[PDB]
Structures are given as C-alpha cells and as structure tokens.
Amino acid sequence: ICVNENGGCEQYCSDHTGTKRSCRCHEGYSLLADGVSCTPTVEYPCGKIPILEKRNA
Amino acid sequence: IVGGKVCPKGECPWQVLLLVNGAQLCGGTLINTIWVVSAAHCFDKIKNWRNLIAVLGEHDLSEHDGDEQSRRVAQVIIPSTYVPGTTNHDIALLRLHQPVVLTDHVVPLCLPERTFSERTLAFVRFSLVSGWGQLLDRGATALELMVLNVPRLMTQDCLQQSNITEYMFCAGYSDGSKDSCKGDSGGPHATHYRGTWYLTGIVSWGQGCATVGHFGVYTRVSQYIEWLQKLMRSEPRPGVLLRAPFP
Numbered sequence A: 001i002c003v004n005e006n007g008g009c010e011q012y013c014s015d016h017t018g019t020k021r022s023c024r025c026h027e028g029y030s031l032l033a034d035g036v037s038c039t040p041t042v043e044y045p046c047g048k049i050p051i052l053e054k055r056n057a
Numbered sequence B: 001i002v003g004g005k006v007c008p009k010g011e012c013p014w015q016v017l018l019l020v021n022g023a024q025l026c027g028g029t030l031i032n033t034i035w036v037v038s039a040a041h042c043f044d045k046i047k048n049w050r051n052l053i054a055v056l057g058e059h060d061l062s063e064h065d066g067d068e069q070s071r072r073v074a075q076v077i078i079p080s081t082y083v084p085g086t087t088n089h090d091i092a093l094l095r096l097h098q099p100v101v102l103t104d105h106v107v108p109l110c111l112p113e114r115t116f117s118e119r120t121l122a123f124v125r126f127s128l129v130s131g132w133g134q135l136l137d138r139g140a141t142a143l144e145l146m147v148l149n150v151p152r153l154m155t156q157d158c159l160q161q162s163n164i165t166e167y168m169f170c171a172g173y174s175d176g177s178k179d180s181c182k183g184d185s186g187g188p189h190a191t192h193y194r195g196t197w198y199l200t201g202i203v204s205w206g207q208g209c210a211t212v213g214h215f216g217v218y219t220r221v222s223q224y225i226e227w228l229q230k231l232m233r234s235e236p237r238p239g240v241l242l243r244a245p246f247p
C-alpha cells in the first residue's frame, strides 16, 4: 500500500483493488523490472543535479 | 536567505530569477522547459506586464558567465482565490515565451503527484529554500545564490511553537537565525526523496524575516498539483495575466 513507505516505489504509487500496487515514474524516467525503481531516459531528468550526478558516475 | 550558504554554481539548477525592467522582483522554480512556479504576490503591483523576464542558470548577479538564459514571461496565471496583498493561495504559474534549453546549469525540479507529496514528501523533515533575497532583516540582497536547509513543522506544532491555512505550511526556525526573506519570495522549497528532488513549497511572505518567535510561511504546493497540471495542458490566452478558477 502506497501510504506505508511509499508502497516501496522510488517515485509515484497507485493502489488497485486487491493486494495490488503499481509504481510509476515521472516523465523522463522509466520503471525497472523490479517494479519500483526509476531510471532516467533523458540527459536532464527533473530533480537531478547534473554536476553532482557526474561527480558520482 | 538569512543564515544560509552560497549554493555552489549549478547545484540549484531549477532556481529562477524574475526581473521587472531589469530589477530583481522575486524567485521562481522551473518545472518544465516553459513553465515556472512563483508566488502570486510578486505580481500585486505590476503595471507593465510586458517587461517581466525570467532568468535561468543564474548564479552571481554581478557577472555574465554564459550559462544564463533569459526569457520573456508570456502568461502569469494566478488562482481565483488569491487576494492581492494577502498570503493565502500565494502561487503563480508562469509560461515562458520560448522554452529554456536544459543544460548542466538549467534543469527543472520535479512537480510531484499529489498523493506522493501528501503521503511521502510531507514527512521528509528537511528541505532546501533558495534565493537572492536579503541576507539579514533590513539588509542588502545577495549577489550569489543562497540556500538554506529548513525543517518543516506540522501546522498544529507551528501554532503552539509560535493564520496558517491548509494551503500553507511552516518551516524554519524560531530563534531568528535562519529564514527566507524579502527577495526570496516565489523561490523553491525543494524536498529530496530517494535520489530526486521535488517541489513542495513556494517562499511566500509575512511581517519580517528571521523574526524571533516566528517560522517561515510556504505555499503548500500539494494543494495545487491538479490545478497546475490542468493549466499546463491549456492553450495560452491573449493578455499576460490570467486568473484561473481554483479549485
């Protein structure tokens, strides 16, 4: 459930009827096969700081 | 910003500077290549709506380094519920005339989904506030962008520890050392969650800055996600100022 620990989602979380949950990602991200993690799909995704992301690559 | 530090160049890449006839007006936050979020009150005294400029990639106001990108403000959208000269509903959505170009120094802040913001981000204790505002109460504004980490208060705790409506939240410190200040309004209150930063507040206003006994007041962006998203899907309208129904 999305209200506890964000449903285990890195970003956005929807509840569905049942014990079902779907995570989703902002534009410029895609959801990995874990069903929870979001990875950028563009060079300048929202909410990341390029000079810090390049300091850690 | 009182009691913060210089934001290292490029570390606040969503920060906007708003100018009117070249003069500092307010801050803002880039959320897409054409859309900036700011505070409604920043526009209470505008006469010439056609001379508003947004600058992205700014850092040191004394120099041009080539990372800055300036754009004309094409539309200023304010909720119908906002009353000039007051605090409640203090938000504006600004459409740029032409997109900015995303670069290492120009990057949007993520506008979160409402549920996520209410269920998750609202419980992250510390967030960053930034701007070129006054460095002290009754003091000069900053020439380099400043940033401050502030903790958020639940509104019941704000009131006890000090109107704060459901469209606002408090954050900061009651000992007069650390606050956002005049010149910072409109800028971001940005919250980190699992490796990404999100917009959770807008620097609003009140009586003084870093006043002992008082916390900073921020517009509660989670209340406006749907309003914002709908407007971003709409066509532009002639005339810069648009009042849009809220909710």
Ligand SMILES: CC(C)[C@@H](O)C(=O)NCc1cccc(-n2ncc(-c3cc4cnccc4[nH]3)c2O)c1
Pocket: B025, B026, B041, B042, B043, B044, B045, B180, B181, B182, B183, B184, B185, B203, B204, B205, B206, B207, B208, B209
């Ligand atoms: C009455 C009218 C002549 C006059 O008030 C007017 O010019 N209104 C428009 C206008 C346009 C931009 C900024 C401001 N403006 N003035 C004060 C503050 C301000 C104080 C403050 C304290 N703590 C955090 C943020 C804070 N911000 C501010 O943002 C007003």
Ligand SMILES: [Ca+2]
Pocket: B058, B059, B060, B061, B062, B063, B064, B065, B068
């Ligand atoms: Ca500069």
Ligand SMILES: [Cl-]
Pocket: B233, B234, B235
């Ligand atoms: Cl439309």
Ligand SMILES: [Cl-]
Pocket: B049, B050, B239, B240, B241
């Ligand atoms: Cl006009």
